[PDB]
Amino acid sequence: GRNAQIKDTFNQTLKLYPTKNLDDFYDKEGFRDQEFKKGDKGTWIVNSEMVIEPKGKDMETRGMVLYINRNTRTTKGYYFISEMTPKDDEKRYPVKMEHNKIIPTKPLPNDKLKKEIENFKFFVQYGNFKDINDYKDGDISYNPNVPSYSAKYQLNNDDYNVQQLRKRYDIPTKQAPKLLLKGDGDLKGSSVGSRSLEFTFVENKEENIYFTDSVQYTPSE
Numbered sequence: 001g002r003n004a005q006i007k008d009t010f011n012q013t014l015k016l017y018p019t020k021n022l023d024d025f026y027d028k029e030g031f032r033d034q035e036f037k038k039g040d041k042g043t044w045i046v047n048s049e050m051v052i053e054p055k056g057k058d059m060e061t062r063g064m065v066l067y068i069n070r071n072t073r074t075t076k077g078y079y080f081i082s083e084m085t086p087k088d089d090e091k092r093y094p095v096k097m098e099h100n101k102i103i104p105t106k107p108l109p110n111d112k113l114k115k116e117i118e119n120f121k122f123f124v125q126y127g128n129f130k131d132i133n134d135y136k137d138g139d140i141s142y143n144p145n146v147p148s149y150s151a152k153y154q155l156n157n158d159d160y161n162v163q164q165l166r167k168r169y170d171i172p173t174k175q176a177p178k179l180l181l182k183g184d185g186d187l188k189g190s191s192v193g194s195r196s197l198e199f200t201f202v203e204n205k206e207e208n209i210y211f212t213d214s215v216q217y218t219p220s221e
């Protein structure tokens with residue numbers, strides 16, 4: 001049924017974890033459909049972000065996005081910060097990635113920010129998942145409109161990925177998160193369709209703490 005097609009496409013995403021050297025993406029071809037021109041080897045877009053909005057404060061978002069272009073074999077993007085719940089207060093700090101190092105291309109307003117960039121690791125570089133069918137009490141959702149679909153699982157605080165996130169980020173909640181897998185576009189795949197995952201620590205009306213990651217192969221601009 002649709003649940004098995006949803007699990008299958010999501011398992012294909014989980015399989016990328018980990019890719020510890022980002023340069024390996026220069027030599028990885030993802031799913032190709034008719035939206036790619038014959039001459040375009042594609043671009044991998046990697047995006048990791050941590051969102052922390054504690055009760056009664058601003059929703060602070062910090063993350064990075066890299067465009068790993070297989071045609072140029074060069075990688076550019078930015079580190080971003082937002083304090084808004086496109087984001088109307090986003091500040092982007094440009095970077096490049098060479099030999100698996102993140103290098104700012106303009107000076108930073110302060111050292112804390114320069115060090116966060118320099119030491120940055122995308123969740124694809126260190127995450128590692130089980131087979132999707134090994135996660136426990138999954139709510140699988142399917143909407144034919146887009147179509148869009150999701151798979152939601154409850155994790156435990158001793159889960160390897162949860163521990164890695166708590167090591168690398170100061171996450172102000174003790175709660176074990178949900179693993180939320182999200183996708184849209186034809187189930188077989190689409191260069192225009194999305195795939196993302198989320199570790200949802202807290203989700204309510206006045207407090208939101210979550211981490212999002214996406215690693216996607218797309219046609220180059």
Ligand SMILES: [Ca+2]
Pocket residue numbers: 185189190191192193194195216
């Ligand atoms: Ca896609």
